[model samples]
Target: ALEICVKAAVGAPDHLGDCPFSQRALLTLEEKSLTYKIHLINLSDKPQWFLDISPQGKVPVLKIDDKWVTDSDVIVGILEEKYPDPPLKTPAEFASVGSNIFGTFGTFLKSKDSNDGSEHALLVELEALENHLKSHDGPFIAGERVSAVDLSLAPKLYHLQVALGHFKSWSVPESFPHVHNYMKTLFSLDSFEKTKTEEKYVISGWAPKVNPV
Candidate 1:
């Protein structure tokens, strides 16, 4: 029974930011079934009050009661501690597997056409996730129940699939059935569906890198 206000970046047509961090925070709030309100901002234009709360001008700033918290991972831990109804922690091993997926993907996206093995490296990272899902009893990364890992990774996957498909005509290989189903299952959730950025915004966000003007 807390008053929670999430300050996130705004995008097109009901889409939140293309930011994976903010998206993960929103997913965490939804998964907990916590009653919260969201205030969207344009990161390019820093509002005075928003800067007062988040000096770094980042999205996913959590305003709980009269206190403010930033950093998506920190916010997730706080929320988990504050509301423990549906546990979101994943097994240590499962958690370990995803630690580098987003970072690695970001690096890959930056150097995609260098013929420096970025795509292969990204696929290798994905294989870790694919194998984890294959070995677990999962509709999610951390098994049947959605966990913090799933919330954290889902947005990145959307960016990967949409951006890469648009940029490189690439898709997740059908060879990874578990990974495919994992993406499908996560996307099916109300929380995930509601928080997903529209394909157009996702494209526009990555256009500079993929199709530099």
Candidate 2:
């Protein structure tokens, strides 16, 4: 077992809006049955403690054992590697594909300079993923087990759904039923369920909903 410290406030399930990365990390931890502590940060204004831990200045920091791992993607990979009882990545190819999609989605959302076909390209790319999963027979996309593609893509889907509600420019259609069902299933699990934070305590507007217990 490892002692993990995660940012509580910034990208918390509730307050900081929603931290997809954190949620995925939570899923990995929970699935692995690891015990962790929530170090909630002030989303309104991040403190120097967080900045010191993560020079890039981001939430979702994981203090595993004696070392600290910043960035959700890196932390998840570490989790999968350090504890491989339940694998999070299928093969190198799928893992690489998952990494690409996750990074691309991050770029798409942060790049505010939306025009041309960037947004459209993102949608098409997501549709392609959904289509790939649709072709898959089992509940997971990579094979019989949950893979890195699932973990990596989950936050992206949350961002897309949240985007559709917030931005008129972006759209994730109901035609992609697999995604909706997938979100519903994954977020409802105990691991994902434990990571949720209440957003009403901090920000307003819109927030993600945890599946009912």
Candidate 3:
């Protein structure tokens, strides 16, 4: 029997974990209907055992049998390959989506400056996603079926929507209707809905960044 354990970061307001990457790890398991135990760890005070397993001390570390795997990207890949039932392969182009959006979002979140042009850069990335969505059929990033790419990007998109709105009153532009619709569809999924971090924690995590003392 293979035992699986997933360790994720504990978020604010109650130490409940609200990490998007961790959510993806859990979602992948849910998508595959795999049984696993979730272990929440306070990232601020990581246990020595977890540190032993993960040198970088990052959350979303997967313990399968006796082996440990870190990084959400690598963890998802290992899960897919080991299961190989639903075949949730990541699209080649989808790899860049996070780097593009997250990098700018981090900058904008820290600065919260309208003159910084981060909003414009974000818009450009959203537009690119919109165009990509347009090329596919209704629902899901990879056309008819959902893939690892969709799972990976959906949580980030949720954070982007929520955090941007909280910090800057920014919403997805009406011009990118495809992207809007894509988000609506993704949020409706059972896998995503189950792993959602409470809104309060998300807000708490950003409040300091948005209005730092």
User: Which number leads on TM-score?
Assistant: 1
Error of 1 at 149 (Å): 0.9
**What is model 2's C-alpha RMSD?**
6.2
lDDT of each: 0.76, 0.61, 0.75
lDDT per residue as tens, model 1, 94-178: 7766667667666777774668888788889889888887777878776669898888888888888887777677788898888
| TM-scores for every predicted model | 0.89, 0.72, 0.88
Clashing pairs in 2: 8-39, 8-40, 9-40, 9-41, 13-197, 14-197, 14-198, 14-199, 88-148
Judge candidate 2 at residue 191 and give its lDDT. Answer: 58
Each prediction's number of clashing residue pairs: 0, 9, 0
Model 1 TM-score, all chains together: 0.89
In order, what is each prediction's RMSD in angstroms? 2.5, 6.2, 2.5
The candidate maximizing lDDT is: 1
- Candidate 3 TM-score, C-alpha based: 0.88
Ranking by lDDT: 1, 3, 2
The 10 consecutive residues of candidate 1 with the worst lDDT sum are 1-10
Output the better candidate (2/3) by TM-score: 3
Cα lDDT over the full model 1: 0.76
